[PDB]
Design a protein around this ligand. Structure first.
Ligand SMILES: Cc1cc2nc3c(=O)[nH]c(=O)nc-3n(C[C@H](O)[C@H](O)[C@H](O)COP(=O)(O)O)c2cc1C
Ligand SMILES: Cc1cc2nc3c(=O)[nH]c(=O)nc-3n(C[C@H](O)[C@H](O)[C@H](O)COP(=O)(O)O)c2cc1C
Ligand SMILES: COC(=O)c1cccc(CCc2c(C(=O)O)[nH]c(=O)[nH]c2=O)c1
Ligand SMILES: COC(=O)c1cccc(CCc2c(C(=O)O)[nH]c(=O)[nH]c2=O)c1
Lengths: 313, 313
């Protein structure tokens, strides 16, 4: 018995991978993610030029999860493109490249260059619809006309199957609107739910201080705090986007949390805070634990229970 | 050393009270909250007509908090108005009456009727904006045009100081816009942050089932899941609404959580899930725990540390 699967025309040894931004910034990180037992890896979201990101401390974790305001530090698109084109060993596992340009034009410029490497090598694209705050305007994925623009422009410029990383939604009307926008675009083959829960605030009682330096302590939350929000979003998109795959991200620390994502409809399962805290060994534990739940229930395949969460009456 | 506060022209023995919807539906509930050591109580959010609410199970709790889709079950406005005018003992503690009409017209009708009792007895109004409007539109407080409408008409119909219960926000743009709307209305003297984190989904791994019946399992999240989100919202409004009070609500299980809310800027501190789970004995524990933290830090009153959370640099 094994957790092997095929999608987007690639084979994956198991449904696990890092979440974008975790253990994926440097050549050292990507090589370590490659050497792990993960099923796939995703590079850090990049911009055209390298960025240092925000002042430190800019990430902190706690028993129930993490807060970050990293500021999109990254080595620049040229570095991740070179990683995808010359350095990654595709015989080991698939690679996804996350892009997060600060304007539509910047995104269009990076995807035009990624297209022939995607054709030649099979690197897959994850378009990240989250960016640093611009006063007077909402996040792109919270502004449905801007979202529709980015997607129209990228699908035109890239011309190949790609995926989008979405922030969480909290209102049913927003699920219906966002999914309708995503469904206008046949090249969006996968949706990743969810990015960190925006602008939480952790305060330390002893020091009476916030715990990260940028943005007066405000930053995105991950880990145990966000599991039910992550499951709601995976399931909301699984139901509304029957012709796409959903990848689950948020709150995965155990094979049980992975099993819940898959029941909710997840095809791949990304690990962020728990990977940051435990290291790449977590992938062999997560495989063992999900296999163990499956055996106890009598499930031979992920397909037997994916998206089969039961409702009452 | 003391927990006493005077606000809104009332005196409160301590900052604790129930969160609306918890232990406040019936006369029996309200007399219980009155007999407890809470500094105040708020009645269940009511509609003009009595409501049975959604089918059960519609609330469930777990180690890290709760999920609910109650559907606004309540005994109807006439009951809560009668409780405020004839039954509540104001010599014990102040009363807030929460209203949550299904349309602006229903809100307006309630508050015209409330107004004479508010002037005579001193009951204080909390208008719930984290509430359904027209289906397929977002809840009122996530639609800034509907929000401005509700506040204009309620200000006019009521003519007295009131407060508003707000859903959590996740994007800085929303904090900016929401506070600017609120700051248009000088009768809005307090803002309660936050209502439940909307449409999460809790799944039970053993049964492979959702845990509440309404809305295919989707429901509002409370408790340990939402503390950082609640602290962010309290601090964001404390900073942006310098002429208003902020009441904090979300994730309070201990005097230490209360202490964080107050450093974030909370005046009153409300207790929902932990109160539902532990019962009204929680209020003596919370007061003890908060006084111990204060004693250890040398704080003699709440004003010494309210709003004084430190940032880094
Ligand atoms: C330090 C850190 C860096 C991150 N950077 C990115 C990023 O560059 N791109 C992105 O799409 N999401 C990024 N995220 C969000 C994660 O991909 C993930 O969506 C989030 O942490 C929720 O998952 P978790 O509960 O497993 O942490 C980052 C998260 C963390 C904690
Ligand atoms: C069973 C239940 C019923 C609730 N009903 C209401 C309500 O009627 N009006 C309201 O403004 N909020 C209501 N809420 C939200 C609580 O007031 C509170 O905002 C939310 O639970 C967050 O606080 P907590 O983390 O202490 O639970 C309810 C919450 C629960 C769990
Ligand atoms: C609401 O989004 C933001 O505030 C924001 C700020 C800086 C960078 C980004 C994009 C990269 C990113 C980051 C990051 O590099 O700070 N952290 C996350 O949790 N998710 C992300 O997608 C988003
Ligand atoms: C028809 O009214 C509703 O179905 C409904 C839905 C969501 C929220 C509300 C307002 C009451 C409320 C409830 C509730 O009664 O379901 N639960 C919460 O966690 N916060 C609330 O403010 C009503």
């Amino acid at each position: 018995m094994c957790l092997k699967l095929n999608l987007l025309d690639h084979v994956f040894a198991n449904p696990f991978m890092n979440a974008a931004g975790v253990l994926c910034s440097t050549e050292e990180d990507l090589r370590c993610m490659t050497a792990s037992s993960s099923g796939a890896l995703v590079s850090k979201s990049c911009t055209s030029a390298p960025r240092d990101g925000n002042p430190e401390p800019r990430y902190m974790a706690f028993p129930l999860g993490s807060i970050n305001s990293m500021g999109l530090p990254n080595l620049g698109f040229d570095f991740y493109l070179k990683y995808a084109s010359d350095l990654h060993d595709y015989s080991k596992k698939p690679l996804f490249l996350s892009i997060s340009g600060l304007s539509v034009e910047e995104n269009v410029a990076m995807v035009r260059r990624l297209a022939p490497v995607a054709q030649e090598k099979g690197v897959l694209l994850e378009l990240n619809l989250s960016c640093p705050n611009v006063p007077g305007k909402p996040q792109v994925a919270y502004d449905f006309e801007a979202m529709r623009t980015y997607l129209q422009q990228v699908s035109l410029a890239y011309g190949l199957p790609f995926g989008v990383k979405m922030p969480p939604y909290f209102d049913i009307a927003h699920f219906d609107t966002a999914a309708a926008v995503l469904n206008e675009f046949p090249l969006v083959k996968f949706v990743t739910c969810v990015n960190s829960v925006g602008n939480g605030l952790v305060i330390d009682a002893e020091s009476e201080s916030v715990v990260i330096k940028p943005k007066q302590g405000f930053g995105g939350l991950g880990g145990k705090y966000i599991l039910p929000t992550a499951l709601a979003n995976v399931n909301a998109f699984y139901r509304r986007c029957p012709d796409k795959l959903v990848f689950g991200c948020g709150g995965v620390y155990s094979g049980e949390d992975a099993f819940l994502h898959i029941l909710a409809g997840a095809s791949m399962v990304q690990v962020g805070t728990a990977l940051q805290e435990e290291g790449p060994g977590i992938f062999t534990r997560l495989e063992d634990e999900l296999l163990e739940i499956m055996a106890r229930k009598g499930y031979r395949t992920l397909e037997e229970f994916r998206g089969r969460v039961k409702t009452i009456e």
